[PDB]
A paper describes a structure:
To see whether the C-terminal helix of the zebrafish [name] tetramerization domain plays an equally pivotal role in stabilizing the overall architecture of the tetramer, we created a deletion variant comprising residues 302-331, DRp53(302-331). SEC-MALS showed that the truncated domain remained tetrameric at high micromolar concentrations, with the tetramers partially dissociating at low micromolar concentration. We determined its structure in three different crystal forms grown at different pH (5.0, 7.0, and 9.0) and ionic strength, up to a resolution of 1.0 Å. In all three structures, DRp53(302–331) forms essentially identical tetramers with orthogonal packing of primary dimers as observed for the full-length tetramerization domain. The last turn of helix H1 partially unwinds in the truncated domain, and in some chains, the C-terminal carboxylate group of Val331 folds back onto the tetramer and forms a salt bridge with Arg314 from an adjacent subunit, thereby displacing Asp229 that normally interacts with the arginine. Analysis of the salt-bridge patterns in different tetramers further revealed that Glu326 (Glu349 in human) can adopt alternative conformations and in some chains interacts directly with the guanidinium group of Arg314. This observation of fluctuating salt-bridge partners in the truncated zebrafish domain supports molecular dynamics simulations on the human protein, suggesting that the stabilizing Arg337-Asp352 salt bridge is part of a larger fluid salt-bridging cluster that includes Glu349 (Lwin et al., 2007). Taken together, the crystal structures of the truncated domain show that, although the second helix forms additional intersubunit contacts that stabilize the tetramer, it is not essential to the overall assembly geometry, which is stable across a broad range of pH and ionic strength. In contrast, the packing angle of the H1 helices in zebrafish [name] is not significantly affected by deletion of the second helix, and the truncated domain has essentially the same dimer and tetramer architecture as human [name].
The tetrameric transcription factors [name], p63, and p73 evolved from a common ancestor and play key roles in tumor suppression and development. Surprisingly, p63 and p73 require a second helix in their tetramerization domain for the formation of stable tetramers that is absent in human [name], raising questions about the evolutionary processes leading to diversification. Here we determined the crystal structure of the zebrafish [name] tetramerization domain, which contains a second helix, reminiscent of p63 and p73, combined with [name]-like features. Crystallographic studies on the zebrafish [name] tetramerization domain then confirmed the presence of the p63/p73 signature helix in [name] proteins of a subgroup of bony fishes, providing evidence that the last common ancestor of [name], p63, and p73 also had an extended domain with an additional helix that was subsequently lost in many modern-day [name] proteins as a result of divergent evolution.
Numbering used by the authors:
A (entry chain D), B (entry chain C): 301 to 331
C (entry chain B): 300 to 331
D (entry chain A): 302 to 331
Amino acid sequence: SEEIFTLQVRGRERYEILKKLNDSLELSDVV
Amino acid sequence: SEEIFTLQVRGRERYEILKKLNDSLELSDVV
Amino acid sequence: GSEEIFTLQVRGRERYEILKKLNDSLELSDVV
Amino acid sequence: EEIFTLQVRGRERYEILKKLNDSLELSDVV
């Protein structure tokens, strides 16, 4: 199984930063 | 109104890294 | 004891800016 | 591109930012 977690964020800039990092980790992780 | 953005994250370890970063970013008034 | 400060090297201005925002936030918040 | 520096206080803080930087070097998202 996999688990999807929800992280709630205030402030567009905060959200945009975290989205870029999430996207990067999706692509850099071995799986 | 205040917009709360949702960041969907696969996996506990990935979530915990991003949550730590969010913990910091939410304390920062100017990002 | 003492404190260690590490030089993080980042390629590219836009990548530098995102990591700078994070580091600046961490310096204030001290969450790590 | 140029390489820029950021001074990072403390090993654990350096390690989290290094993890992100290394990820970005692999993914090229930013």
